[model samples]
Target: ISPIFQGGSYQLNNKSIDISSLLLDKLSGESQTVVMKFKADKPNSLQALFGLSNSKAGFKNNYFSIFMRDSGEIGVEIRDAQKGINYLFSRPASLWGKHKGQAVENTLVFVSDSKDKTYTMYVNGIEVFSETVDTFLPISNINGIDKATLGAVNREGKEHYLAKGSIDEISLFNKAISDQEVSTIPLSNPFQLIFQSGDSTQANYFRIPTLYTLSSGRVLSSIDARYGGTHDSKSKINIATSYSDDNGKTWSEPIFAMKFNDYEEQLVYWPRDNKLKNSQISGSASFIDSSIVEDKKSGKTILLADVMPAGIGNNNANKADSGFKEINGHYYLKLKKNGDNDFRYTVRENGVVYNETTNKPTNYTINDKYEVLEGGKSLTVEQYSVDFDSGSLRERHNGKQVPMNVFYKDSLFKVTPTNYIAMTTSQNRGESWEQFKLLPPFLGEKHNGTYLCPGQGLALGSSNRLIFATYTSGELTYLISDDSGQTWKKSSASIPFKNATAEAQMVELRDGVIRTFFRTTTGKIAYMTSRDSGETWSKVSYIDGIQQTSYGTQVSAIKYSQLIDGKEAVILSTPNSRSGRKGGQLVVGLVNKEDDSIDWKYHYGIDLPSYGYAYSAITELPNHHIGVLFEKYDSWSRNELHLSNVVQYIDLEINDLT
Candidate 1:
């Protein structure tokens, strides 16, 4: 035993210990339970808690163990070598552990109920996972005991994955414990980690949270479920959502609100290690940066997100085509064959492909699954799967693969690699959403490309217009809809500041005045006011005090329904650091009734000044609490890549802002 016995605990720093016969005999390996209290040296690192194996060769033989991995994964493993049975269950540590720079202390409980053929995991008395399996292995079934080790696992006749930090105390129950008994454990966590890295969705990363409150008092939150790291595009990412009816006390299980079908969702690391060939995931279609708002008149909530085609992002998206061809007076989605120079194919009604030159229907068509079809038969084409190790694409094999769609890379026909907008509507308060429909390239042929809003859209009641801030040719623009998105017109606005148009948010200051807050290269919280119903005229003004970096970040602001200090107020969430995207804070502005100038009065911190923070969204809860969903870590930071709990939510009282 190399672990030193501290005050009522064992300090395990690169330490290991052989289990005594006394405890080995006590483990029944049948119906069992384990309650462990330990603190990991680092929040995100691979370390073994304990291991029970019979072989000196390694855990290849019959064994069981509990462990942690670098990507915020907490795993439990059981192996029956003789029976060729291996069972593993994992959940992200972000569920219960505190944020970075703080010790990852957890009071974990493991239960194996032979009667139910199930295994359950509880952290701080909260059941994190419970699964019923066809086969179950308890500790006693493993033909391992004499080689059992604490603080490490013996592999190749040597101690490996030595534990660092301290193990306070562990209790072993030979009999399966009841859920009531597990409830006795205390809960120290105040907030819930809603979307974590490597969660059930198998998404390795998450970013860009948009929180909204519907008219029914239903609160909805959504984020970019980045599959191949947190890169904005050229990677498979989807819009995932969760909602709560009873405020933030509990939430629905996360579901994909919007998704791209071309590529498989596989976890691939980025930038941290150049293993993925410059972290370029070409051909991975993505839906990034969500902006959601509800129409007060129609009572339908609309969700908007930037739709990226295969191998495209804002940084490398082709400036040529918007994927739409104006045939006659109307526009239709245009496609070109793999080696074609001109886009002569148009997607007609009901997804039928039409040859513009022949003025007749082509053999190609798209099915409900977005797969290409021909002659009413399945057009079987090999599906493209990403090779995580090389960041390359290879034809998927094994079982019968689904035919590739026209939108997929290297397909028979492909759309131009430009950015578009995906619009989805939820009439039931986000319980279910209609199939996503692409808003016609509102930028039209004159503009370069289209980028949809990243934050919440504005439902300007006074102007009676639904405005979603858009970016075309990297310039400030708006997709204005006068008749409730039935028809849209492009309105362009120029800011006096240089390069000041990215991820902007808006709020109505009064009946006619609408203020827009936007990110700028000037490194300040910049804003502009539009007095004449977004027909607009105002110089670029900035909110005083808060500063940001040139890399900039998305912000969220909304008009507070109630008054603060006898003055109309607006609440905004953003990162208040100039050095980097850290030090997230809330700024409350008191509206001046005289000139409509905002007095940036109240400021409050959300997290530590050194903690990573970026990209935030805010909404007012039914109870009048300020609800915000924000990226907990600055994913752009080299040290904070692929963080486990990227998005976090917090509700604050109005008085707390002061």
Candidate 2:
């Protein structure tokens, strides 16, 4: 009998058929009805085949089926209605097919809702597949279902066919299942694993200018700025050496020479003994803008100039004010031997002591007096004294009354005392320094009140003589170092100037004429030439086309051996403020012999629109390249100041000139 059932349980012929085996076989034939009921013992294998036709027979269209085997294996198949045609199949298998395990017992069945067109498969009370087909046939149409049965496919000539597992219930629907209804099935648990390697291209990594070589045969021209540092917060400076071998092409790095430190103290005088005591002044060392030159008399290289070590007060410290003490201040010059590199120093402090006692004939007289207080207030005299106790002078005066014998020791009147340039020498280059003992007091009290800052020194022609320039408070003074910087004597004529700071340089020409250049705080460059060896100088003339700010400027000159386009050439670097607060250029000029004029050849601005750089020193390297060292800071503030030294290579051929 063909019966239709729609309930949770089923009965066959009023007797309970073993429906557990019915889950293993697919529903086949067009008009076949199924009635089964079973309980799942353990999870096992299950499968369902939809058709058993060779070409045209039972279930000739695509169909959907679900079944479960005894081993809990549950599967769903969608087959083409044509014989030997497969559509979709699901079996017991791992995602990667590497794991092996046993299937479980599960109850599953397929319910055909319509007549051979659409059907749905359910496994363990869950729908597994829903599909549609075009062809459907009864078992009579496929040779009377010869090998088609329920629960399991009927093998050839086999009568009993059933699943090894159990199925609780089955149903049939007359319509196709929608995607939303098929999505209601429960999903299986998912498994995942990840794998990770350390060879990447993205990980750690400086260049500065050191030295260079040029085309000319002149080697070891000028080497400066070897080493430098600040001894204290107040003192900071650089040391360098300049030497020429072939001509003026190549040079060696500057050697370490000497250092300057500034200290501040009180300068007191003992009235009873008529001697000065504690005439101490505190100040930082001021870098002397000078270069080294070979001495002619003793064939040695000497560092000539004066350094001011004035105590620089801390902004946050509320301590006593300090400055360069006059009585303790002296002129100093360091000298080194030709073959040896050891260095030594010589200092000269000339003061004026007043003999204003009632017993003396002259109320204000000049003498070598060491006594402290001679009278009350009516003392107008001049004297010169040397501090033989420590071998150095006591010129620094605290901001108080002048000491007894140390005349004009007050800080206000004796900031920069009337000090003459002194000379000294060392057998070794710069190993050890000696005391200051060279020239005697040049001017008495008249010149003792004025400050004289000596610039660099140079040899005069082939003679054993050296000449140096000095700018006093008012006038320019020249000194001759005859005994290899051991002693110096003042010259008769002085460079005419007023209220100017002196920084001068000298270079000897092939014709034995010595040319000297001087930079001032008045934005002007002055020049003078001497036919004789610095015995006299020409009237100072202004070098046109060169303009600087009111601040101190540094200038250097070196004569080229080969004429450039048949003209003598020299290079200079200085702080130019022609552009106002924005600052301007560092210029190089060519001197014209035809009209005694200067031609501005090249110019490079040091101060950018928003930045400022000052206090520059320039030197030529072996390859005719230029090296520049300067101090830079943000113009708006002094907190970001730094010292930078750079080297630049340039093609200086006539054709490359611009």
Error of 2 at 218 (Å): 13
* Tens-digit per-residue lDDT, 84-136, candidate 2: 44444232211110001222222334445446455554443333344565653
Clashes of each: 2, 77
What TM-scores do the predictions have? 0.73, 0.41
* Model 1, residue pairs in steric clash: 29-139, 29-140
lDDT of 2 at 453: 29
Q: Best-fitting candidate, measured by lDDT?
A: 1
Q: By TM-score, how accurate is candidate 2?
A: 0.41
lDDT of each: 0.73, 0.37
Q: Candidate 2's C-alpha lDDT?
A: 0.37
Per-residue lDDT tens digits for candidate 1, residues 1-658, read 1112112277777878675554676665478787778776343367778777765555455667888764344667887777677888765433333332345467778888998999988765455457788877776687554666677777657776777766777777777788887877765543565676556566877888888888788888888998776777877888988888987777887878787666666664444443533465676677888888888877888898887777778787776777888877787788887667888898878889898878899888877555677777776544455554444434343343556665567478777777778788887878787777777866666444556668788888765588888765446788887776667777777766444446688898987678888887878877888887787647778866988898788888989999999999998888899888877788899998999988889878765565567888888899999887787666567545554455767767887787
